[PDB]
Structure formats: structure tokens, C-alpha cells
Amino acid sequence: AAERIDVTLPGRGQLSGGLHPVTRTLERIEQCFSRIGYEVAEGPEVEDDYHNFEALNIPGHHPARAMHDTFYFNANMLLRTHTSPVQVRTMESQQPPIRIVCPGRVYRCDSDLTHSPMFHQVEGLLVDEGVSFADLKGTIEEFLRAFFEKQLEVRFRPSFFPFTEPSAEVDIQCQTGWLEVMGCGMVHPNVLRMSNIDPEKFQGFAFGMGAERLAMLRYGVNDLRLFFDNDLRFLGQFR
Amino acid sequence: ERIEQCFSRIGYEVAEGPEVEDDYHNFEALNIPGHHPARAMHDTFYFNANMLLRTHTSPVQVRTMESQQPPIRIVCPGRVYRCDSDLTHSPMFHQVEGLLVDEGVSFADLKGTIEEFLRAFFEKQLEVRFRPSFFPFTEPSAEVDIQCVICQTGWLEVMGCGMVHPNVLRMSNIDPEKFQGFAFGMGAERLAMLRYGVNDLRLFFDNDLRFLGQFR
Amino acid sequence: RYPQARLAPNNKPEARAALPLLRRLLVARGYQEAITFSFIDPALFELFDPGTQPLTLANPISADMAAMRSSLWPGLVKALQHNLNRQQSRVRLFESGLRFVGQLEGLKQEAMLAGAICGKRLPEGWANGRDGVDFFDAKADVEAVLASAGALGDFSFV
Amino acid sequence: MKFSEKWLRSWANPQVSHDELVARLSMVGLEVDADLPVAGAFSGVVVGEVLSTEQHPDADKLRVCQVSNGSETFQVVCGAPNVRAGLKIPFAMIGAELPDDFKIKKAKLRGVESFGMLCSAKELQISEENAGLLELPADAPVGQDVRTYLELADYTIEVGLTPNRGDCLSLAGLAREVSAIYDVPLAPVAVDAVAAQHDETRPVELAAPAACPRYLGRVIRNVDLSRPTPLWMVERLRRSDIRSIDPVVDVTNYVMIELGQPMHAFDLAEINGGVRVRMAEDGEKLVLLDGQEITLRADTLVIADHQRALAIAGVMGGEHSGVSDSTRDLFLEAAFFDTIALAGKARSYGLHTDSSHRFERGVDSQLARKAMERATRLILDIVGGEPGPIVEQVSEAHLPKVAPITLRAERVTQMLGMPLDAAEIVRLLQALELTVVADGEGQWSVGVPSHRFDISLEVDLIEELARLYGYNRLPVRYPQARLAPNNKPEARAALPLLRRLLVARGYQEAITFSFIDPALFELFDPGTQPLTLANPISADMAAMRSSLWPGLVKALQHNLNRQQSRVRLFESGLRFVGQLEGLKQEAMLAGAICGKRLPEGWANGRDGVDFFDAKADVEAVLASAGALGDFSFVPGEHPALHPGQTARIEREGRLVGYLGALHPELAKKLDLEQPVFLFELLLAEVVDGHLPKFRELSRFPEVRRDLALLVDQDVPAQDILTQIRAAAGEWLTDLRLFDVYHGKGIDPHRKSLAVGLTWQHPSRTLNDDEVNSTTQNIVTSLEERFNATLR
Fold first, then answer.
1. What CATH class does A19-239 carry?
2. Which of C105, D249, D302, D473 is 20–30 Å from B149 (CA)?
């Protein structure tokens, strides 16, 4: 006689929202490293030319320092072009070992459709007594496999960066079936020397990757402008 | 959760297994022979002659050692069952059991790990003391003590550990000449009581909201 | 090769409400995460922060991106109206980021958690009340965040 | 293992305080569980002799004594029933300070002077004996301090031994350790052979030489068993928690506690044609000295004669064979029993003795002779008699032998994290009586002494080195790790994540026992045979749970019965499905809710929780890894749930779990007057989700149309919505059910469903004609499938 019957009707109240695709990506990258002894390092977004450039082996005359690529407040204070100045602040504060990942908002002047005046990047650093290029190759290759959840082919090409020597541009499969996803290299001796780390005793490797770039490859996002627009028709797709 | 995090941050994988085990994984493979008093019905819950309720989380470590070759860095959290219960002991409790198997593992390595784990867990630079003890599966073995900082001599037995016995490795097809290892164990409720100031172990399984609501 | 590491167990204190935790709470509590530009229009800055001199860029990309934000509210309100102007009626957003307070000499770069909500209290459903969101709905979201590390009593709304 | 410190120090004196010794012991693997003084403090009490006693002239209950202290005679009045001439007793002189600040003064008891006091053990805090005065031995030294004589300046130490240190189950083993720990000279008891006074012997046969490779037997004739056990032995045993029973048992216990050799004496008269050490026959019956009638197995070693079994070898003696009042002649036994052969045998008959324990843990295979000579001297000194020659039966081929161990210095360094000097390695191992001999560079050959049954491998030697050097003295290093970046897949709802969601969604986590009452099991799982325990702790904890619901419902009512009205709980754990052959151990997430929907507040509706409140909690969990679409709630039935309010949750036709209101009949049975909503999910079916696949946003407006639909009250709302999506076309961006009507406005067998339909074209605007054309075909489809009408 228990005629208190009812249906398959949707539940009552509020359900969960979601995170931003970039936040998911930053979190995921951090986890690949924090699981193997890396500490998450943070610093200011408004930096000085020493931490942002000089200390990273970028001299005065260097085209990156120019107002055509860097946002300035005055002659010494600027908006950070990379998260590497956090690595400097770390190297100045402590002595090796150093295993840090630097996620954060970075600012480039020269913006368009394929580039944003604000974006996020994760920059890693490892400084110890016997670090090789084989060590870096191994780290990068296993990180990309873990991140992209596939046993993909990883290619290293020689490139230039003022703060790393030797340096490389890292490619993964899928016009030549290769995609430039990140940059890395062995920390340049002058970089260590400047931050009072003896390069004769200590060696190190650094790497960098674009958060939005990775998020676009992973999720199939075409327009970089979608990230900063915050349309719910876009955001709601990452619940 | 907190224990798992201290290790998962430094390359340890969380390992899980069944609660209903066989006498091989639970005892034989852990260097506990047939005649051993731990095997008796006075201490172990049985279903039949071979199947039982696990006395420890160590059989997961066995299942891992059988499935893979070193390195091995695992933490085994889970429900464990002891027959001999009272007021100070529960017939069901939780424990985390760790294992590290690699090419050059020392007792200094174990001492270092345990001492830094207790400091991290109890969030203090407390004094850690190691006393010689016996366990069938580890040799040499120790009982780990900490000061009465987190409230007879101002020392508290919190966990047990030791270097993995060669027969344990040998049995699970790991060469002891090449590979060395350390294992450790701790009581979840014991640690929770020290940390939170809980007096009665029975409060945990009662689930009174006046108790539970204190851990929000 | 894979680098060698003499690693020791470690962990951050138990009684702490970290930002990843707070984000997930707000997600569960029906919020959508937003990421807005740190540089905003000086006129917009002035609306939410009157009498305050913004940290202004020498070479901004455009004029509407010349002031460093002192609050995440202008950017959130903007994202909220971007959606409202795009056939959205219930907008629930949150952002975390730095605020920039003062001029270079004495500049404070402080990490903020901000949230903005409008429209009906609940989503459109058969079992849900058609009442609009109010002050006390946002208060509960704040209360939940302030209670995250068992220290809700240390806070007071005055 | 309990012992007198004074007795241990008489063998190996570490030359440190009691506190220092008790500290170091636990620090080396001999954990002190107790350290108590043997007696209370007092001064001025000496051994006195009663010379005469006269009846007190003015008090019948009193006596007037003449007592000497070896220097002077004093008159002392005494009311003790045992006071008489020739008694050696504790004489408390005038001035003497007795326990609990009791000072002895001059007294004139009923007109008679008294110059001291005679004491009982209680008055001196020696024992609880207050019946009368402490009758000291006939040979006690008059004048000597009672504390000096009774060796009251002592402590008893209790050590909780590990099963590998069977050698420390004696004062001999413990003293050897102290000598090792402290590098101090070891002075063992010198045990001289007792010469045979006659040639009477009994033949001994080793019928099971594998179980007993050495057995010693000796005939001791014409013993006076009326004679008492001396005080020094009684005290030494008492200080090791051994009760004095009779001289013969007291000696064989004393020898076992002094040297570590369990020994036994038989009434010679009870031995029919000599000793036969053999395995028991299947169904052989023996009555023990305690009266227990044991029925033996062939795997048990017995000490028998030519007619019958006399005792269970190494564990307990028989009633018939043991010493009695009639006993005039003894037959002593000291033997080595193999640890393997004895392992668990005493326990298998429900027995545990000091003998059984020691033999199982290992008794020095060479000790039997020293012990036999020691027991002989003590027996002759205590009960007299004439010793015969010892009969030693031994099987060399069956004697225990530990092959020499090769110890490598590199391995010690490796394990300890520091190198030890060759002299240190040698000195340390030699102190443990190990035979260390060089075997080339940084390698030795070490031989194991006869009392150690735990040493056989190189690691055991390194353990000993670590132990003696000091565990806390050893270095601290953190292990090296060749680590590579790694992470679990992105699109997965792990249990820690799901827990935190439920916490945020207003739930309290519960932990219940996996074993529940079989009657409770049967209520939620009728006709299902639970996986039952052979040895449950109690009957109400005999069934392995097949659901977390019984335990949760129970915790819910525990609170309800404790002034709680709003109970919201969740638990995660294993369910146990089927019998051992085919047993499934599956991780479940379950939740239980009752009371008001919201907590008590000024801004909150006073409505009670319902099915749809629990459904939202489930929906939120199922949506956690972006795969909510893969799940479907279909009308179902469960024996523990209300058949009108039950949903079967499915993923690709596979069962995920159930969500429903607890069955009213079950609530009745459990005395629950409130509606309760349950859910249980197979975590294996919830974890896998989908990774975000970006779909391009349109630059064009969306078009919305509302449809009010009249349908059969029993047709499920999900079937209608499914049919709408089927007919809505490729441009439908959203479909919401915003109202359900079942009232006066329409037919009572019908219901009006208010649905909102949203459309967006990715490349242009939508015209009214096409949108109205789509709306009409959706309607026509519903008219043909469910006989739908528009309001």
C-alpha cells in the first residue's frame, strides 16, 4: 500500500562547476615533478632587470631587454618575461641540491592572435654535484610521456638560450609530424657563478614549457584568445 | 592520507591488496613458519585452513615483490585484523607498511628515512630513538621511540622497522647479494591518538558525531 | 639517464588551507574558475579603487591594459558581464592571483582569492526554487572557505 | 625472564648504577618491562637468638624473652604465637628505624621492661607474612644486619625476551650478555663433578635420536624429602617469580633458572627397566602431574620406560612417574631435545611450561653434564642421599652443528653505513663466545657457540655487531633514487577526490567493522550466504559484509539515539561477495542520510531530506571525472530499499550500484521512525572518466523554445528527454526540465512536464520557421511514442 512511488528525475540543487583548462594543466605538470622530490617555487610578477635578465646571462644590449618585447614601469622595474627569476631568487637564498618547479603568469609585449600579452609557463631547475645532459634528456622524455599519457617519440634539436648551454628544442610526434612543445638545456656556468654556485663542483639543468600551448594540444583548443575571454560555453567544457 | 603524502612526495607508490588473504602471502612468504604462535587461531581470524583475514598489510609487499623486479618504493595502507582484542586493542585497525628494495640500501638509509618521516608527520624536530627488536621478516630490526613532546622515561614506541631478511627476498625471487631493502610499519589509530589527543581507541569505530565533528 | 636523489620524507603542516584545496571547494560549491589579465584599464581601476594611484606601465600593449590590478573584482565583473551579454543569466566565477598595491618604492604583490556571483540562487530545475542569489548565498561560500583549515572561529564579519 | 640483580652481578658486574644497567639493556634488545626493589627500607635490625621464654606474670597472651645479638643479652617482651627458645629472628634494637617512620623505643609492657622488638616479615616489609615472627635459618649469623643477611639491597629485573634469545632464559645467559655489553670479566659458578658413592645405574635408550641426541640419567639413593628447601634457593627462585613447592622440584627449577637446563626427577621405583626415549604411539594415553589426561600423537617425543610413557619429553612429567611422600630414591634427567622436533608440540596439547619454552627456544646442547653435576650437589646438600654414576647416552650424528659463517668487512660497512676496525669486530664477536678466525684480507670465518640457536648467517653477525656497537650511535643517510617524472591519467575520479567532494557536499565520514552480525547481514542481503569466520571474536561479528549499508545504518541510528536529528554519513571499503571459491573483494563508496535537507538556520527551509537530495550527491560523484553521461538511473528494486523509490545505477549495461530510500519494513525492524536514503557504488565503475575534447563556440545567438507536455503519470521523465534529444536535431545545445505538474489543473492519471529547449547553429543565426518545424517534429514523435499532448 506504499504508494509513495517517484521517478528518474534530476537531483535537487547545485552541482559542481569546474577549473580553468590552464589550472588543470599547471596542476598536472607540477604533479609529474612534485612526486619525485621537486618543490613548487613562486615569486613576484613585477621584477627587476637583474633577476629577470642580468642574472640569467642576458646583457644590456640584448634585443629581449628592449621595450618592443618587455613591459616596463621604469628603467629597472618590469613585468617578468619568464618564471626563471624565481630560480635566481632560489639559487641566491640556498646552496644545492635544488629541485624546483616555477609555475606562473608571464608577460610579453609583442602580442597578436598566435601570442597573448599574458600567459602561463612552468620552468624547472635541478642543481646537484653530478648532473649530465643524459640526465636532462631522461627527465624531459619521461615527463612528456607522463603528461601526454603515451609512449610517444621525443626528439631533441640544438637551439640557443642565453641562460642554458648546451640547449635544445623538444619535439613530440603528431607539417613533418613533429611538434615543438618545450625548451631546455644545461645551466650556463656564468648563471651559477653569478648566483654564488661553483660550476666546477655543481652542474644543473633547466626547462620551460607553455601552459596554454600544452592545454591546447591536450584538449584540442584552436584559439588562444578563448583562455582569457572566460566564456562559460568554453569553460564548462573542462568540468 | 598524511602518512602516504610524506612518502608519495619522494617516489613512493601507494600499494593495495585484498583483506582476505592466504597463509603464503600473509605468513610463509614473510618468514613466519607453520609452528609459529602468530599463525594460531588465538591471534589470527580464519575462514578455512589456508584462507584468513590479514594480520598486517605486508602481504601486499609480497604481491608487489612477486609481480615486479627492483627498484620498489611502496606504502601499504589498509584495514588489518587481529583476533586477541580488548580495550587497548581493536579486532580491526589500520596500518601503513612501507618497503624499499634497491641495489645499495643500508641501515643508515632506514634510520634516516624513519627519523625524517616522524619529524615531518609530527611537525617537530623531535628526538628519535632506535632499539634492537625481533621480527621474522626483518633482520636487523628495531622499535622506534619519540619523546613525550606530543604528550616511563619520556619515550614512546610509535613504529617498527628493519632491513628485509634475505630469505624474504630469496622467496620472492629477488637476489639478496645484489639487492638490499628496508621495511617499516606503524599503527594509524596509534598515530591519530598521539596527534589529536584521543584517549579511547573505541571512539574511532563508534562514529559519534560529537567525536567526528571535532576533525572538520 | 635519470638523475640520482638522496631523498627524505617530508610534508607541509596538516592544519593549512592551500589554494588547490580552496579551488576544489568552490568547484564543488558550484563555481567556475576564471583567469583575467593582471593589467586593466585605468578608468576601470579608478571605479573599484578611487583615489588610488595604479602602478602604470610605460609601454602598455593598449591604453585599456595600462594599470596593474589592486583587486581581481574589475576583471571578474568584466568576465561576468561578458557572459551576461552572451545569453547567460547565472554567472558564478572565481579567480586567484596577485594584486599590486602602491608604487615601485614599497610595492606589495599579494595573492588574492576572489569570487563574483549573479542570477538565480540555484540552476533551472524541477526541484529547485526560482529565487535569485543574495548576500547570504555568497556569505556561505566565504564561510566554507574560512572553515577549510578548522579556524572559522578566528574570523569575524563586521 | 625475571631475576635478582645482586645474583647477576655476582657473575658479571657492569660497575654502573641500577638505572644505568636497566637503561642499557633495553638499548641492546633486552627490554626491561619491570625493575622493583626487593624490600622496604629500615636500619638497626640484626639477627637475634632467643635464649629462653617465660610466661608474662600479668598477661597470658605475652611472653618474656631473653634474646642475644651476639654481643649482649636483652630482655624483650613478645606476644607472637611462634616465639620460643632457640629461634633465630630479626631483632630490632632500641634506636632502630623500621618501615613507615617507625622508631623502636624502650617499653615497659604490663610492668615488665623490653629492650627492643622481634619482627615478622610484614613489620619489615619483607613479605606479607604477619602470622608471627620471621623464623630465620638455624645457622643464621647472630649480630649480622638482617638487610645484609637477607640481601635486601637488591632489585628484581624483568626482561621481555625476543624469541631469538632463548639463551637469555637463565642467569648464565643474561650474565654472558652483561659481560659482552660492558666488556667485563665473566665469573660463572664453578660446577665440580660429584663422585659416585655407588655403581647403581639405569639403562637409557635413544629410540628417537633425531629428537633427542643427548640424554643424561643418574640414580640418587636414600633421600630425605621431609627436609626443607634452603632460604637462599627459595629467595633466588622467588626473585625470578618461581614459587617454592618441594626440595626436588625447587632444585631442578633452580638449576634451570641458574644455567638454563630444564631438569626432571622421577621416583626411581616408578622406572620399570630403564629409560626409553621414543616417539609416542598414536592414541597413547598419559596422565600428567597436574591430572590432565592427554591422548598422544606419533609426532610427540615421550620419555618412557619398558612398560609405559612416563612424561611428555621436555614439556611435562606424568603423575605416576613423579616424586611422592613414599619416594626414597630418585632418577635425575638432563637432556637435549631438538628445537624443530618440539616446536609447537606443548601448545598442540594446550600446554606451556618453563621447560617447554626453553627447549623450543633452544637449550645449550653441551650443558646437560654441568647441570647434572650441579643438581646432584644441591640434591645431596638439601635432601642427602648417595649419588650413582652418570649414564650419558649421545648420538653424535644427530647433535646440532652450525657450519662456520664467512663474515666480510665490506658487508659490515655497507649495512652499518660506517666501517668498524678489525680489532673491534673481533673483540665484540669474541665476547658473545663466537669463534672468529681470519680468512684472508677483510674476511673471517666465524663459529657459533652451543647456546646460540639464532646465529647461522652473515646478516645475524652484522646484527650482533650493530646491536653491541649501538643502534643510536650508527650513522643516518637518506637512500639514493634514480627517479623519473610520472603521473596517473588525468580523467580519473580517485577515492581521495570523491571523499573531499562529499565533505564539501555536507557529509561526515564513518569507519565501521567489516565483520557484522549474520542476522543484520540477512536483513540487507536475504538468501545470501555470508563469508563466515571460523573463529569470530563474538557471534555478532561473524559475517563479512556484502554491503557497507548495515554498518552505516547502524552508525546512523547510534547518533539518532544520541540526540542527533540530521545524520549525513559516508564510508569507503571492501564488500565480500561469495564463498572462498570465487570470492570477490570489491571497493565500495556508500552513503546514508536522514533528517532535514538543510541545517537549522534563519535563512534555511525546514523541509526534510528526500530521494532527490541523495540523487544530487550521487550525480556530483558520477560527474567527478567528466563522464556523468555514461551513467543512467533506471527504475529498480533492492531487498533493503523501498520498491517505489529505488534506482539501479548503470554504466554500459554494467551494474554500478543502488540509490534508494531504506525500506520501511527494515526501518520498523531496526526501530527507525525517520526516512533514510542510501547509496552504494562500485568504485571500479566510477574512477574512469573522459578527457576534455574542445568543441568550437558559435558567434551566433541561441534560440530557446519551451514545451509543456501531458503524459502518463507512470512514464519516466528520462525516457521523454531521451526521445526529445533523438528528434531535436544536431543544433540542440541544452535541454532542461524546469517543472513537473500533477494536480487539479489536469487529469489525475497524467502529468505536465515543462521542458526548455535551447539551440545554437555554429555558423549562422536560426530562423523561426526551421525552429518551429523542429519543435513540431519533436511533438509529433512524442505523440506517437508516449501519446503526449500540449498544455
1. alpha beta
2. D473
